[PDB]
Amino acid sequence: MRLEVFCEDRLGLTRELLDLLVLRGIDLRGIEIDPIGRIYLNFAELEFESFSSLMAEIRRIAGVTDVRTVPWMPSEREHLALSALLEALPEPVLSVDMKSKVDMANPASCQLFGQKLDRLRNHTAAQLINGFNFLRWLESEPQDSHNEHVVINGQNFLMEITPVYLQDENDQHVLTAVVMLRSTIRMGR
Amino acid sequence: MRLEVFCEDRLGLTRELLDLLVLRGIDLRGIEIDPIGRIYLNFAELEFESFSSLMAEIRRIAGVTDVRTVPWMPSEREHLALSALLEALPEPVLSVDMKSKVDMANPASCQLFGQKLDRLRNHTAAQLINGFNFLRWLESEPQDSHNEHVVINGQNFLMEITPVYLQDENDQHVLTAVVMLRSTIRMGR
Numbered sequence: 001m002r003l004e005v006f007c008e009d010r011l012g013l014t015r016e017l018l019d020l021l022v023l024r025g026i027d028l029r030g031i032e033i034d035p036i037g038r039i040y041l042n043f044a045e046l047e048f049e050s051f052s053s054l055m056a057e058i059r060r061i062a063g064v065t066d067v068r069t070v071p072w073m074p075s076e077r078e079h080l081a082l083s084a085l086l087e088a089l090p091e092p093v094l095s096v097d098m099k100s101k102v103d104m105a106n107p108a109s110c111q112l113f114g115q116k117l118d119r120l121r122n123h124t125a126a127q128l129i130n131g132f133n134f135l136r137w138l139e140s141e142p143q144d145s146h147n148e149h150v151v152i153n154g155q156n157f158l159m160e161i162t163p164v165y166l167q168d169e170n171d172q173h174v175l176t177a178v179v180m181l182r183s184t185i186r187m188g189r
Numbered sequence: 190m191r192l193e194v195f196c197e198d199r200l201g202l203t204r205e206l207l208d209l210l211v212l213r214g215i216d217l218r219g220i221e222i223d224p225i226g227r228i229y230l231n232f233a234e235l236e237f238e239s240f241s242s243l244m245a246e247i248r249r250i251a252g253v254t255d256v257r258t259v260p261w262m263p264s265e266r267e268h269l270a271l272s273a274l275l276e277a278l279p280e281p282v283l284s285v286d287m288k289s290k291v292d293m294a295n296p297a298s299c300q301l302f303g304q305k306l307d308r309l310r311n312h313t314a315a316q317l318i319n320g321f322n323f324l325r326w327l328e329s330e331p332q333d334s335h336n337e338h339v340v341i342n343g344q345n346f347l348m349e350i351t352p353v354y355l356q357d358e359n360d361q362h363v364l365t366a367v368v369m370l371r372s373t374i375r376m377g378r
Binding site: 011012014015018019022028029030031032033035073074075076078079081082083084085086088089090093095104145147149156158160162163164165168170171173177180183184186187 | 208218272274278366373376
């Protein structure tokens with residue numbers, strides 16, 4: 001949850017806000033400040049009730065002119081736009097580290113394997129996809145991308161695998177051979 | 190200027206740290222807390238003599254076990270790791286906003302359209318790719334992905350454009366018709 005607090009230029013206002021979060025059982029994840037007169041607050045979802053009296057309570061603080069909920073902290077905005085677009089990808093995307101452990105994985109990567117992100121992230125890559133040697137490839141210090149054909153839950157896909165940053169690991173896409181043929185026909189004069 | 194402060198889990202530390210910076214007149218922009226027990230500070234540039242005094246006084250706050258400058262906030266490390274996935278993707282990827290203006294684009298895209306990313310961002314999608322009404326499709330309130338065969342600089346592509354989030358634009362993926370056949374031909378062995 002992200003709050004934006006509008007306030008005048010007053011001594012001690014930021015402290016009195018953090019005290020208030022502490023009094024109320026709320027553990028702070030982030031606070032950002034705009035010199036113009038805005039304070040953003042990051043903490044875990046409140047239930048609706050604790051939420052509304054808190055807003056009211058923040059508005060009573062000396063120097064606060066207004067509060068609202070906002071979709072992101074200034075710090076989150078761009079990396080959330082990046083995540084959104086990668087999560088939107090209609091087919092499986094997912095990244096792995098140097099130990100080939102799954103890191104980033106999109107919704108389709110989850111639905112195909114039939115599991116939520118946090119279990120899926122517990123896997124190395126060869127545990128999820130039969131037929132390829134991830135760790136020996138990532139050991140290979142790779143230049144180019146790799147294309148392999150794989151079957152996953154009895155389904156034909158093409159898997160492409162590309163190194164990431166020096167070698168901080170790799171990311172890879174999967175495309176259904178069946179979806180490709182249906183979709184290259186999405187032209188029929 | 191960014192610091193990382195390691196600290197024991199003691200009541201009042203974060204706020205005492207905030208009081209310190211308020212009092213030294215430090216132009217604090219951001220704090221991020223690491224669920225472990227690490228606090229990151231982002232503030233405007235200090236002269237060297239003050240940065241030093243600051244870091245010295247911080248290391249003497251009770252319960253602080255260390256302080257060090259760091260190149261990035263966690264949010265910024267996250268942004269970097271997501272930019273790196275996007276930029277590694279072998280084939281063109283871009284996103285566009287609700288006016289179909291280009292927001293992000295990977296190097297594969299910069300290379301295709303022959304423009305550095307800065308300039309790519311000046312263009313609507315229909316200024317870069319013929320044979321698709323991007324803006325019209327955006328105003329359709331699309332739910333589903335769309336595939337279109339497009340020709341870009343005389344090279345044939347299958348184009349999949351997908352809607353992003355609570356409609357904020359779209360993700361575009363272009364795959365060469367020819368690399369696909371080559372890959373599905375290789376898949377035969």
